[PDB]
Amino acid sequence: GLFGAIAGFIEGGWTGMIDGWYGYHHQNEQGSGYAADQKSTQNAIDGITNKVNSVIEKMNTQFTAVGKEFNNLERRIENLNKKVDDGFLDIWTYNAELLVLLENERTLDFHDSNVRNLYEKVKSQLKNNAKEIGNGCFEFYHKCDDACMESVRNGTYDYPKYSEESKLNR
Amino acid sequence: GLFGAIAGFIEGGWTGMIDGWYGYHHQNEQGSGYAADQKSTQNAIDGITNKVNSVIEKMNTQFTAVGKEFNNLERRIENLNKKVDDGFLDIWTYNAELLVLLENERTLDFHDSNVRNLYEKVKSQLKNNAKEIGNGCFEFYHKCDDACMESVRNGTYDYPKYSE
Amino acid sequence: GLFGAIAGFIEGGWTGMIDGWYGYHHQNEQGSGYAADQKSTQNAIDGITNKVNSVIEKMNTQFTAVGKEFNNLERRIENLNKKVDDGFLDIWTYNAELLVLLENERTLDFHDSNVRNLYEKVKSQLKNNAKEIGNGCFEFYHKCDDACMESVRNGTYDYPKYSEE
Amino acid sequence: DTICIGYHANNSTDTVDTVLEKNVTVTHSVNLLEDSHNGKLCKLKGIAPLQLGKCNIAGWLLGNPECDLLLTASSWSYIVETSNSENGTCYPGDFIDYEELREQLSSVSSFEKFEIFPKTSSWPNHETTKGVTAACSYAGASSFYRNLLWLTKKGSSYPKLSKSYVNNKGKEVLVLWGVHHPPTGTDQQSLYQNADAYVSVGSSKYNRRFTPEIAARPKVRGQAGRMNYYWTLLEPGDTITFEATGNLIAPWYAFALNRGSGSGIITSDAPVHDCNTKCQTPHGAINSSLPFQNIHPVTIGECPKYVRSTKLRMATGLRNIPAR
Amino acid sequence: DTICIGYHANNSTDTVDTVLEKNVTVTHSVNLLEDSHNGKLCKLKGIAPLQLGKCNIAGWLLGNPECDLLLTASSWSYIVETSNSENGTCYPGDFIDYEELREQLSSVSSFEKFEIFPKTSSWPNHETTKGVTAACSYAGASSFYRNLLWLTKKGSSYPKLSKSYVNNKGKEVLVLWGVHHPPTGTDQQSLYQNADAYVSVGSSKYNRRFTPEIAARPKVRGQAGRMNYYWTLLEPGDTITFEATGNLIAPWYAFALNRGSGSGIITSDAPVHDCNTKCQTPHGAINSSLPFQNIHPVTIGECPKYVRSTKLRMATGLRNIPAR
Amino acid sequence: DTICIGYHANNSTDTVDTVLEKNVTVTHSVNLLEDSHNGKLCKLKGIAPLQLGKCNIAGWLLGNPECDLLLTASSWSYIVETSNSENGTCYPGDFIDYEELREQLSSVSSFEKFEIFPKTSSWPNHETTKGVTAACSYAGASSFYRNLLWLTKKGSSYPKLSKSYVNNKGKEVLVLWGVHHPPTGTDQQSLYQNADAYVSVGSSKYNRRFTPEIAARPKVRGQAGRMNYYWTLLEPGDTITFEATGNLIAPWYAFALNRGSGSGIITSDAPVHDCNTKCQTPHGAINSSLPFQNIHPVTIGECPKYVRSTKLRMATGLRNIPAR
Ligand SMILES: *[C@@H]1O[C@H](CO)[C@@H](O[C@@H]2O[C@H](CO)[C@@H](O)[C@H](O)[C@H]2NC(C)=O)[C@H](O)[C@H]1NC(C)=O
Ligand SMILES: *[C@@H]1O[C@H](CO)[C@@H](O[C@@H]2O[C@H](CO)[C@@H](O)[C@H](O)[C@H]2NC(C)=O)[C@H](O)[C@H]1NC(C)=O
Numbered sequence A: 001g002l003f004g005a006i007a008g009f010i011e012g013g014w015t016g017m018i019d020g021w022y023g024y025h026h027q028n029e030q031g032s033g034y035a036a037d038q039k040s041t042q043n044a045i046d047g048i049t050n051k052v053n054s055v056i057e058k059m060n061t062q063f064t065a066v067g068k069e070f071n072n073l074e075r076r077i078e079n080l081n082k083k084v085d086d087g088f089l090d091i092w093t094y095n096a097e098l099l100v101l102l103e104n105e106r107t108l109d110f111h112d113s114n115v116r117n118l119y120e121k122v123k124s125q126l127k128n129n130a131k132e133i134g135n136g137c138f139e140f141y142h143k144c145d146d147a148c149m150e151s152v153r154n155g156t157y158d159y160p161k162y163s164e165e166s167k168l169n170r
Numbered sequence B: 001g002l003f004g005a006i007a008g009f010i011e012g013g014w015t016g017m018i019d020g021w022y023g024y025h026h027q028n029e030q031g032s033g034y035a036a037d038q039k040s041t042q043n044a045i046d047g048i049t050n051k052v053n054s055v056i057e058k059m060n061t062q063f064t065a066v067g068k069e070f071n072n073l074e075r076r077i078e079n080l081n082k083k084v085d086d087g088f089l090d091i092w093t094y095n096a097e098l099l100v101l102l103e104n105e106r107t108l109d110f111h112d113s114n115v116r117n118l119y120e121k122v123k124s125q126l127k128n129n130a131k132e133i134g135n136g137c138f139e140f141y142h143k144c145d146d147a148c149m150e151s152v153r154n155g156t157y158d159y160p161k162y163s164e
Numbered sequence C: 001g002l003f004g005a006i007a008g009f010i011e012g013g014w015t016g017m018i019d020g021w022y023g024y025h026h027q028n029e030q031g032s033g034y035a036a037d038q039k040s041t042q043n044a045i046d047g048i049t050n051k052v053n054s055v056i057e058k059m060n061t062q063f064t065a066v067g068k069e070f071n072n073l074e075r076r077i078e079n080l081n082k083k084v085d086d087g088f089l090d091i092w093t094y095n096a097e098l099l100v101l102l103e104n105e106r107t108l109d110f111h112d113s114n115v116r117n118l119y120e121k122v123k124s125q126l127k128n129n130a131k132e133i134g135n136g137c138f139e140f141y142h143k144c145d146d147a148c149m150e151s152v153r154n155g156t157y158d159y160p161k162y163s164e165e
Numbered sequence D, E, F: 001d002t003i004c005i006g007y008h009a010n011n012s013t014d015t016v017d018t019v020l021e022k023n024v025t026v027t028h029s030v031n032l033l034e035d036s037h038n039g040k041l042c043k044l045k046g047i048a049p050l051q052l053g054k055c056n057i058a059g060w061l062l063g064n065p066e067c068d069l070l071l072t073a074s075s076w077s078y079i080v081e082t083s084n085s086e087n088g089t090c091y092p093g094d095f096i097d098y099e100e101l102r103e104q105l106s107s108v109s110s111f112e113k114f115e116i117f118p119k120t121s122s123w124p125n126h127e128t129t130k131g132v133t134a135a136c137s138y139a140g141a142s143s144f145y146r147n148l149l150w151l152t153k154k155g156s157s158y159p160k161l162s163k164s165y166v167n168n169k170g171k172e173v174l175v176l177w178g179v180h181h182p183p184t185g186t187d188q189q190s191l192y193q194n195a196d197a198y199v200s201v202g203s204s205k206y207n208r209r210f211t212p213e214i215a216a217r218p219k220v221r222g223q224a225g226r227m228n229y230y231w232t233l234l235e236p237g238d239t240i241t242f243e244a245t246g247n248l249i250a251p252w253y254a255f256a257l258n259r260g261s262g263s264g265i266i267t268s269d270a271p272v273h274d275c276n277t278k279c280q281t282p283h284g285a286i287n288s289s290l291p292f293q294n295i296h297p298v299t300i301g302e303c304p305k306y307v308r309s310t311k312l313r314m315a316t317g318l319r320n321i322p323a324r
């Protein structure tokens, strides 16, 4: 999208990862599987939860609102009263609909940013020790087992450990 | 630039490419020339067109709106009426001008994002087969002809690689 | 961070750099020290200054606004007049607070984008002549002195290269 | 050996709208627009609404014969008129400041009705019987308002009357009355006997004088005569004095008012049901925590902001792309 | 061999504003603010507006001598008053509920003027001639309204007059009239011949009895007396009865009204032309599909929302950098 | 060797709110909400406000005996009523169109008070002394308004009076008067001596006749009679004529008015001080160039837009991360 990650360089999503919004699918000698990223999924939940609450806060509930009557000699006053009701209605409908459209654009771009940022967090951990394929996948040069995989989706990947990579890298 | 592309790492625009908003240049043994990217130019046109139509949608046209008269003993009511008119006018003027400012910022950043994304789609297509100069240019290693150039501005590149 | 620079791949900021918003730290054989980037700090100051002035422009000051009295047979008009005051007040309180919330989001992202762009301007200047560590740092291969440092934070680097790699 | 980075997806067919694109299916979303009501007029804080039925406020407060069910009314959460509330002013005339009275009633939660000027004791020198009309008929016979007393002359004499009431209650007392306007002078004298009558009503803040407006008019419900209806709010401790030499439709029953906020009058043909709510509308009740609703502008209690919108769905998840 | 990614540019000098930066030349943009009108008052749905000229609403409806051009009027799309519309009430006095009457006319699209009480037929025992005043002079000679009839005593006799009208028009009928208040009792006798007179008016919802207030006041247009003007909307099938022993300015011509929405009263010195539009303003007509305009707050038909803005340009293209 | 890119930080503890996150410590920020006032009622453009004290508008303009400090008043930047402004109408009655009068005074910056009808010169055939009452006492003795004159019969004779005033002031002239309404016909005779009296007031655009409404109302400040107060704005060159055979509370002093915009009436218990401002509220004065204030909705001068917000701080710097 606005950040070329979602529906971009990562063409599609995963109906298979049900633990969260963003995550990994690592494939191993031990096997395959999906795993959601808590750290980044929770910050997205905290922010979106906060966005929705902020919107509701600005829109105060409406209290007792009844109509007024007017006699046949108060048409000007009756029309003034109607103009105000219709006026205030035009404005709150406008604001409500318009605020949603705008924040909907923002929210979708918020997720897009989060995927891009997660991808680039991993990419800068691995560097040489893997090659970027395309669909947001990293092909390892040095072989990462279940335990090693967990250090990548954990922010504790160890580069140096891995010039084995420099061997398979050619 | 919010995405550092337009007026950023691509210093200027081309008066020469007149087919669309985003595109390529390409210098070859067969010759030079410009070519606009249909895919990306179209989506921006569909999106911007939609933004404009949505703005116009929220602003409902004003119907018959005349003024009222009041006698000399109706100054309070006349002032209420006037407070209402001036009031709604302050708000709509505010909403109108303010929506445009904000959306204009979004639109310029939208384009900026569209160029940045196009450049990176190519960069990840070529990889070793080209080096990144500046001004979002790609100097080929494997020397590409007009038929190959069209595979790039196509997303169907192909990879045959040496060096370099 | 919407652009992952601030509080992102550059974990923290420098209480030591007091000249501007964005800048460099060099570290050389001749010594360390901070240095703010005029070009990019000014543009941010121009943009933000203009943003704050633009918000204040849309909020016209309030002139004389007193209240009205009504007799005990004018409750409907008194309530009309009160519905109008409370109504407009509801809307302006909404507009003011809501405009700030939104722009505040944009402003933090604006700075973020600035840091991210400044970083990538240097990255494309150096290329081979340095390796990307973390925290937006560049470890030079060709070893650069205070005089060459100033060419980097200046947009004029110029690539006498020879790869110890 | 590899690891891939990606995002969530599901069978969700929820769609939202953005500025650049419409109908964007997303994984998670919340609806902000309540569009479901109850179809029923419910209680509010346990207290039931007062149904006027085929009566309006005028009929209820004056005591129009067709409104005798309402004679019991004492407390309510809000008031309901229907599309058939046309039994009010049965003797033709103007209800002065009637809309203002309806506004007052909107902040009234209950009252105690009481006989202000008892019919059998208050009028020794005037005739209290006989004060009926075909235009207020009931059970096939001529009748009159229950809360009002049409005084006429005791055989050939209408002595000047003077009756006062002190407000010994703890609250406002709503006093109503009327002045009669015959079509001719002949009539003015067959009823009153003074051809130059006046009605004088005064308290500490009210002072008004009414002279009969004799004129030739069409018949309305069989009557060329007319009746204007009046009301005032008598403050605690204050005194109201009625003075007249003819034409006074005297007060019979008054109302001691209890103020309260959060009430009002609505128009609805919805049925009342034994149920409770915190948000009532002419169409039905609303049980929602949503910020908006498109059901009705008219509201009573604690309700979501009304809005014209048909759809207000805000996105929480991301774009949904199953790509099977 | 190279390939470069780039963006579009052109010679466009259009500038938009952003929150961070003003005057940002862009490649494409639309103007949302219509500021171009017609300088002409045009027809609306084929039907031309009604110019009142030097006359205002009061003059047009009463039949002020200076407004004989409007006697023909029957249908219009809206009503125009100018800066020189001062010919309304030629004989000094109060036009009761005048502002409300204007409001009523704002939703009237046409009417059929008719002789409600024919000047020659309706007043056998009274004097229909001789009812003119220097304050309503025309052609240099004393005259009076064309729609009202100033009745006077027929040879030192002014018998009680009674005259009813039944509305069999299927529409509302607007009935205007007046009550005259002489400066001296001497004038009262010489006009009516009864020293103590009265006017009475009564319909199904109207009922009043006017009594001449005889006093000396500053001469206005040479007249120390006053004349008060009254109106009422007589509903279908209803009857209006007039009775008087003097001081009645009788209704001569009345108006059978036709209701319609979208009409109004504006003030404009712009010329009416054989032109047609869907949006009219006091400055001129507007032909536009834009969402906004800064021409005028007052609007008739379908118009863009008014706004104080001087400029509302929304960018569609990208920042324009030719970099030649 | 190395070179690192980074951002600024400091010891700032300023926080702002965003839609995604609250309390985000930033490096730089500006406050947009003014919440500091002066606690004082200052002058506007050098000119001091008019403090009414225990008096209200009615007491000031009529000249209630407890408002003698206000006789001197002539110019003001704005008008102030306090929580103890109850001394106004001392003789019980209605001040007709009082709220409308208040609205008029809101656009008045100054006036020249004058003796429109000199007490000792204007009434040769009427009694100008003796027009006092215990309901308007002062210094333990019965007194009366300073700007009005209570005319009474001169020894069993109350001749028809006629008094005119031509407005040669080039300004509007505010004229106040009253019509007295005794409790009994005996009181009517002892005061006026004509049983059937009348008061008549007329200008170029004003015309009204008053007759005594005699009846007994509850005593207010000891009085069972009522006095109704009236005003009118006499236009330049225009003439007002008073005519009466009793019950006239004649004008004594009137006011030539000077219009001006930006003035008004406020309710405040804050003390006036030798001080100058451009923005005044009932709480106190404001010296700010901020766009918003949450101090008070009522304003006089040039002020920041009022808003319910507690906090409006707009971020200018970036997210603050010292990371020591
Ligand atoms: C109560 O209301 C009913 C219906 O609104 C009145 O009935 C109408 O009376 C008029 C006049 O007699 C008739 O022309 C209509 O045909 C009647 N309509 C119906 C539906 O019956 C009734 O007279 C009112 N009664 C009282 C006492 O107010
Ligand atoms: C029609 O309007 C004109 C303009 O107001 C009237 O002319 C004025 O008449 C008064 C009274 O005689 C004069 O004092 C003014 O000098 C006149 N003004 C102008 C501009 O000429 C005219 O009398 C009105 N005629 C009718 C029948 O209403």
Ligand SMILES: *[C@@H]1O[C@H](CO)[C@@H](O[C@@H]2O[C@H](CO)[C@@H](O)[C@H](O)[C@H]2NC(C)=O)[C@H](O)[C@H]1NC(C)=O
Residues within 6 Å of the ligand: F064, F065, F066, F086, F087, F088, F089, F090, F135, F136, F137, F221
């Ligand atoms: C001015 O106002 C004061 C207070 O409103 C009046 O004094 C009150 O008068 C009432 C009625 O007589 C008494 O019951 C109260 O006890 C008095 N209160 C106080 C605090 O004195 C005073 O009479 C008024 N004077 C004038 C001339 O209007």
